Symmetry: C3
């Protein structure tokens, strides 16, 4: 039975079982990561024949976001519970994709309108939810020690979603629109 009712007065438990209010910065941080993970699942459900090449990596991101959320739910001071997420191989893996997707699509110097195909648009939504989760992770960092590797990966991840969004448009022959007042920023 998934409903325990223990949360009905607004408190809940983190890893190690201590109790926090649900609006605690820590709970908010891994809560936003869960929201992002759910949005990535929604984004993956929009994949079509033209965009199947993106499916595996989005599922892999979902697995990695669970690892990130686990670590955000882990208090530094309880030595019974270790951080598990190590940024190097995940983050390199993102960077390789950012480099290959940047190479393939038409180069721009301006910001672009976040949109195009339904999948590209969903990848821009993922980009911005990732950045919202990142803000909450930084909130938490300013009050508690965190696994800083999670922050590295989450920062890189929104660049991945930008590059993937442009690639998704490319895969369906949809051009990106430029912001009509962009200075040359890239």
């Amino acid at each position: 039975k998934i409903y325990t009712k223990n949360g009905d007065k607004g408190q809940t438990r983190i890893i190690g079982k201590q109790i926090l209010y649900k609006n605690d910065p820590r709970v908010a941080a891994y809560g936003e990561v869960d929201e992002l993970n759910s949005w990535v699942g929604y984004t993956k459900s929009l994949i079509n024949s033209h965009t199947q090449v993106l499916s595996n990596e989005l599922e892999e991101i979902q697995q990695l976001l669970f690892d990130c959320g686990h670590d955000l739910a882990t208090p530094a001071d309880d030595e019974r519970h270790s951080f598990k997420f190590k940024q190097e191989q995940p983050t390199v893996w993102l960077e390789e994709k950012i480099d290959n997707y940047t190479q393939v699509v038409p180069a721009v110097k301006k910001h672009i309108l976040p949109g195009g195909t339904q999948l590209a648009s969903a990848l821009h939504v993922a980009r911005t939810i990732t950045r919202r989760a990142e803000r909450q992770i930084v909130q938490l960092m300013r009050e508690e020690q965190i696994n800083q590797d999670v922050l590295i990966f989450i920062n890189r991840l929104s660049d991945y979603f930008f590059a993937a969004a442009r690639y998704a448009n490319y895969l369906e022959q949809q051009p990106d629109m430029l912001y009509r007042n962009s200075k040359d920023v890239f």
Copy 2:
């Protein structure tokens, strides 16, 4: 004319007409409930022939979320304005659905990736927005008396969305994926 312009400097009114800033915790709480309600409307628009059995209950949730938001917009101390939402029958109704949907789908012991079909994925998005609204309701509770029945229902509602999401996948013969590092948690 829906635009009054009275909010153009960032203030607005709650039930009873007092004026608050738009970033007041109370406004944020029922604002997040409105966002959830809109997402539930979007989720319902994704229903297909295979998933029609979910339509009625999602519309009912929308009506209940208006009742919740009304109460969150109601200050305790103004006796002219009563709380209207009573948790027992709504919450029991959710629990019956959680029990029947839990029964029908394949049992898991691990966390699952939030995704699958477009509708199941949208139900996971609903789950996480509900939880975001819940955090904001708890913020407000820690500063002002609230209708605690709203919090009970909102807590239960995210368990409903989890169970419904798994059921939606079942209705389209889509299995759930396990988190590859989940301990047995359920």
Copy 3:
């Protein structure tokens, strides 16, 4: 290379290059506007033959939201960097659309369930994200001078999304549902 890694410890730059934490109210404000802009791109991707008349204006909103975000990223005190967004013509343009869409659809006196077609439902999601961004803009205003024209436009914009959502339902012969406990509020 879009990834600089300068943000990997949670700090970033605004217009004029000063450094802020990513959870700074200013960063959150224009971050929520970026999220809204991405959602408007997603909403536009749902346009069908029946709803093509809405495409141009949603793209125009995306361009205007970049102008708003630019100004939110601009500190008042650095005289090298000017506000660019002027509310009058954008806001009048929204109001004309609100008036024409209000005229055409069936009049209601009660709140409606936010939903209907997939596009109308997405326009209600846009409405509520706009309002979430507005709360964060008001947060920032209460700590720093801002371009108040941005707030005018963002307030009006959520009324636009409400009116457009009802119009989208009308364009596909979908009626709006009333909240079953609404007093006559409009």
